[PDB]
Amino acid sequence: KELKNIHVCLGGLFVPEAYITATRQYVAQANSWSLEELCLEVNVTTSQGATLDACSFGVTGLKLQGATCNNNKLSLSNAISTALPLTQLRWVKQTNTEKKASVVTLPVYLNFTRADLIFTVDFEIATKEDPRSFYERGVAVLCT
Amino acid sequence: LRSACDTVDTWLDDTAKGRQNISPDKIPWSALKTLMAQSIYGGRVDNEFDQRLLNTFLERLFTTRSFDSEFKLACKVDGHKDIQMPDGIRREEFVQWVELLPDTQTPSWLGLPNNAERVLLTTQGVDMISKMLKMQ
């Protein structure tokens, strides 16, 4: 039971993709749901060591490429990598309400080569930032 | 590029049935974009995020707005200036526009951040020093 409360560096794990599936399988088991019925909500904390909900998991070492995260609202940045202190991966019942016209889906790659996709995160953009500009600038998240 | 040129000619000839001036909104934008999204430049893509990037450029560049006077090929390359769509109706006008492009290309021309070339340029500059030193 202590496996759920421990923060995990996804880069350190040998198979980071399997951890994402395991957390998805963990939440659907308690709520008697299917894995397809869970969408991944992402929350980024200012500092590590925050309140961990039952359906939430703490991940460390995620690096934001080409953007900055402030209050769960991405803005385009001219810096290379921005460290995310602690990312809470929360699994919730899917409500299939489409996007929100200010949401970008960011690939999460294992390392800088971007040769291996781990999973996908959804963030809400801020100001008048065009989500298409995020796509063109190659905004992504690195596990290590 | 050749396949895309054949596709452009095939579908433009299909719509403009031997006519002199086809309306821009009657150009088969859906046919051109989809065929390039899926088959031409699209068949090589094995990544959904690279596919989305390919779709983004095609959706921005192949519309009726491309025939407007103030169409914008790229926006804010150097923060203030940006690249305007030439108002040409003949091939020679477009070739003149290409020849008048400045020699100040930055990755912002491509939609990338301008820092994308910083490491690549720095390595080449050191590479030039190493090559010059070796030939001494």
From Swiss-Prot, chain A:
It is found in: Cytoplasm, Cytoskeleton. Belongs to the dynein heavy chain family. Dynein heavy chains probably consist of an N-terminal stem (which binds cargo and interacts with other dynein components), and the head or motor domain. The motor contains six tandemly-linked AAA domains in the head, which form a ring. A stalk-like structure (formed by two of the coiled coil domains) protrudes between AAA 4 and AAA 5 and terminates in a microtubule-binding site. A seventh domain may also contribute to this ring; it is not clear whether the N-terminus or the C-terminus forms this extra domain. Homodimer. The cytoplasmic dynein 1 complex consists of two catalytic heavy chains (HCs) and a number of non-catalytic subunits presented by intermediate chains (ICs), light intermediate chains (LICs) and light chains (LCs); the composition seems to vary in respect to the IC, LIC and LC composition. The heavy chain homodimer serves as a scaffold for the probable homodimeric assembly of the respective non-catalytic subunits. The ICs and LICs bind directly to the HC dimer and dynein LCs assemble on the IC dimer. Interacts with DYNC1LI1; DYNC1LI1 and DYNC1LI2 bind mutually exclusive to DYNC1H1. It is linked to Charcot-Marie-Tooth disease, axonal, type 2O: An axonal form of Charcot-Marie-Tooth disease, a disorder of the peripheral nervous system, characterized by progressive weakness and atrophy, initially of the peroneal muscles and later of the distal muscles of the arms. Charcot-Marie-Tooth disease is classified in two main groups on the basis of electrophysiologic properties and histopathology: primary peripheral demyelinating neuropathies (designated CMT1 when they are dominantly inherited) and primary peripheral axonal neuropathies (CMT2). Cytoplasmic dynein 1 acts as a motor for the intracellular retrograde motility of vesicles and organelles along microtubules. Dynein has ATPase activity; the force-producing power stroke is thought to occur on release of ADP. Plays a role in mitotic spindle assembly and metaphase plate congression. This is Cytoplasmic dynein 1 heavy chain 1. The gene is DYNC1H1. The chain holds residues 4502 to 4645 of 4646 of the full protein.
